[PDB]
Symmetry: C2
Subunit: 58 residues, 2 copies
């Protein structure tokens, strides 16, 4: 439950929130092809967050 472990998990949550925000922006730009890539990237970010949560979470 170290500070290193908490830093890594917070970063994984942040990257997920970034990709969600970016997805909305690309949707707003109507940048369809990029939004679809980003949608997938966000799922993958969620997979990472979940894996980090299981391992580093309290």
């Amino acid at each position: 439950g170290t500070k290193q472990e908490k830093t890594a998990l917070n970063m994984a949550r942040y990257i997920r929130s970034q990709t969600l925000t970016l997805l909305e922006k690309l949707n707003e730009l109507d940048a369809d092809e990029q939004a679809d890539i980003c949608e997938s990237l966000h799922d993958h970010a969620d997979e990472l967050y979940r894996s980090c949560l299981a391992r580093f979470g309290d």
Copy 2:
């Protein structure tokens, strides 16, 4: 080359950089399973970045 376009492209580049910062942290932790997913996530962020770059120039 619109403003909004550039903000989006920058954020896509920022996210690519963040996956590498997390990858190194996961490496420091010997969190092998998480590191391999992160490695692939970087590959995926690079796919998105290059696509935005081709489009938003």
